[PDB]
Amino acid sequence: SQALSDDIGFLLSRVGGMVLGAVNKALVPTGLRVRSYSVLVLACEQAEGVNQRGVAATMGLDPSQIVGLVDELEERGLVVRTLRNKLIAATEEGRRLRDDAKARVDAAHGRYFEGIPDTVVNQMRDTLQSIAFPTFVE
Amino acid sequence: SQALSDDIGFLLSRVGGMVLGAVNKALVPTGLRVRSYSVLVLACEQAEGVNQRGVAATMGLDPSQIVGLVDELEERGLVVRTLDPSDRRNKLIAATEEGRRLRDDAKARVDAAHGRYFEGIPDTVVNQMRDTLQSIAFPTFVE
Ligand SMILES: CC(C)(COP(=O)(O)OP(=O)(O)OC[C@H]1O[C@@H](n2cnc3c(N)ncnc32)[C@H](O)[C@@H]1OP(=O)(O)O)[C@@H](O)C(=O)NCCC(=O)NCCSC(=O)/C=C/c1ccc(O)cc1
Ligand SMILES: CC(C)(COP(=O)(O)OP(=O)(O)OC[C@H]1O[C@@H](n2cnc3c(N)ncnc32)[C@H](O)[C@@H]1OP(=O)(O)O)[C@@H](O)C(=O)NCCC(=O)NCCSC(=O)/C=C/c1ccc(O)cc1
Ligand SMILES: [Cl-]
Ligand SMILES: [Cl-]
Ligand SMILES: [Cl-]
Ligand SMILES: [Mg+2]
Ligand SMILES: [Mg+2]
């Protein structure tokens, strides 16, 4: 089928945007939106700060875009930017808000994947990781 | 897993965004962007045209958001607002000959641009992803 509604690229972009909208809606009480949430999660994965370069690469953004997200998070004392190399270190308050936000984010997920078994989610996860994070550039 | 890179919602938005940016870039020679392209494609799929509400539902948008996309395509002579010959109360967005020719050019670009991401995936994996994403975007009901 050559129909748009059967096209996997269309579908991925459509469901990605549905998830993005739902997660932004769920995040409203936290003051975060998806990109600032993502920087905060990445910072909270480590004790010491995480490499800003690496954050940008993971998120598929230029480092210049991550700068403003770090400023946003620092406005609320959620991360502290430390040192040509730049690292982003989560605070105790950052870690607390990350937990509250993630429960809202999971639920926003739960709503879209209800009735879809974990075996299907696991295969989707692997496939999407192989696209976003390939072993080399073809 | 607590890791962002294991969050299926993150990965959907991450790869969805890769696809969106690649499609806008592939479309630069056509003058279209992802939404105007989608409307043009959906009009071309029908012989007589497609209803605004159908387009909106396929794109997950309110119908009010489709009017300006149709205006853009109409100003370029790529679609025409017409009336369904089988029901004149049914307004249709119909592709023109020039719209069909551009849609063929544009879909060739977008197909090739998608290949970078999807060509290497096993067919059985793609098929399962397709059907799963359809069940999320376009839920079905009782028979
Ligand atoms: C349409 C999207 C996906 C969602 O936009 P949104 O609905 O404005 O959502 P937001 O993330 O801005 O806000 C989320 C929700 O939280 C709400 N919200 C927010 N901030 C607050 C607040 N501070 N207080 C209270 N409430 C709040 C906000 O109003 C909204 O609520 P609701 O309307 O009920 O869903 C938007 O991200 C977007 O346009 N993305 C770019 C891509 C795009 O054009 N998508 C449209 C579908 S067409 C498509 O995907 C085609 C792709 C395609 C791909 C490949 C191809 O080959 C061909 C085509
Ligand atoms: C071409 C895009 C998709 C849109 O840019 P644009 O057309 O030049 O225009 P705008 O900058 O006005 O953006 C249009 C809308 O695209 C929306 N958008 C912005 N990223 C996207 C996108 N990945 N898909 C789908 N619409 C988008 C964005 O929110 C905005 O919505 P709205 O404000 O309602 O009009 C551009 O954002 C782009 O190239 N994105 C690729 C880079 C990217 O998104 N990387 C991932 C960042 S991290 C992230 O998204 C995390 C999400 C997340 C989700 C769930 C979780 O559980 C956890 C995390
Ligand atoms: Cl954005
Ligand atoms: Cl940004
Ligand atoms: Cl219209
Ligand atoms: Mg919006
Ligand atoms: Mg600010």
Author numbering:
A (entry chain A): 4 to 86, 92 to 146
B (entry chain B): 4 to 146
Extract from the study:
The cou gene cluster includes couR, predicted to encode a MarR-family transcriptional regulator. The CouR regulon was defined by mapping CouR-binding sites to the cou promoters and demonstrating that CouR acts as a repressor. Consistent with the EMSA data, CouR did not detectably bind either p-coumarate or CoASH. Together, these data demonstrated that the effector of CouR is a p-hydroxycinnamoyl–CoA, the product of the CouL-catalyzed reaction. The CouR protomer showed the α1-α2-β1-α3-α4-β2-β3-α5-α6 secondary structure topology typical of MarR-family proteins.
